[PDB]
Amino acid sequence: DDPTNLESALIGKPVPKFRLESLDNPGQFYQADVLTQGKPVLLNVWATWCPTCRAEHQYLNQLSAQGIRVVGMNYKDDRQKAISWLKELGNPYALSLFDGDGMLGLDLGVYGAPETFLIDGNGIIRYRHAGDLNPRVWEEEIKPLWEKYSKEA
Template sequence: MNRALLFIPLGIFIAMGVLFWVGLGKENKDVLPSPLIDQPFPEFAAKALESGTGVSAKSLLGQPMLVNIWATWCPTCKAEHEFLNTLAADGIRIIGINYKDDDFKARQWLTAYGNPYEFNVSDPDGKLGLDLGVYGAPETFLVDSQGIIRAKHVGDLNPRVWKKLKPRFEAMQ
């Protein structure tokens, strides 16, 4: 048997390794695509966490907003909460979706840390989150005045992220 043939598997292995290594660098790990971009916010009927009154997708119409998915069990949500309070104080409309959480704990959280939300949708079973394709908390959607989702951010909303999202949000005004 020709000794050169013994090196063919090694050559194939090295070529596959190089392709794998090059492919790792091309992936944008900060973006999780959403099929809901440029689609209407999913229909829902729920109760507002604060008042217990009914809210639906129609409650989101009228002006651009951020829809923030959060939970008391989420440490990253606590990290972003102060910045959300800052945005709300600057006049940014924010709607909350309390995801897979206890309503009582959520109300306590909002009392303790401030409530940047116009209202919160209680989503204890995660059904609305599932309809939105939520991977976990926190996640934030940019929604225009007609209720169309224009962008999605997975992870905490902070000054660095807002610097990138703010032009898109302002373009919806």
């Protein structure tokens, strides 16, 4: 029927509202609208304290380079560390929101990381996977959803 588990929260509803500064370019702020752009996007919860986050990063670059749109959700992290991080490993993201308060994660039902949402063009959350992004997950679970909500263009 309808899944009742905490990983199924927000499935089928609009991204929570927020206002967060960009980690990449200080001074610039963003809101739910940035994830509501008429095309599907991936939102990827990450932080320097997240132990499996490095393990998923290079495949994050790979998708980013084939035109899969990815927005960073830097979760309760240390600003300077996060910067140093993106610098050594590469920057896959359109931008990372600096959720240094943890408010947005909290709004999204996030506990620990990394985690990846597929949000459609209308800002609606369609899928949520806890754990590392990799070619299996992509090919099996996410790719069909990305095509589904891209063809709605």
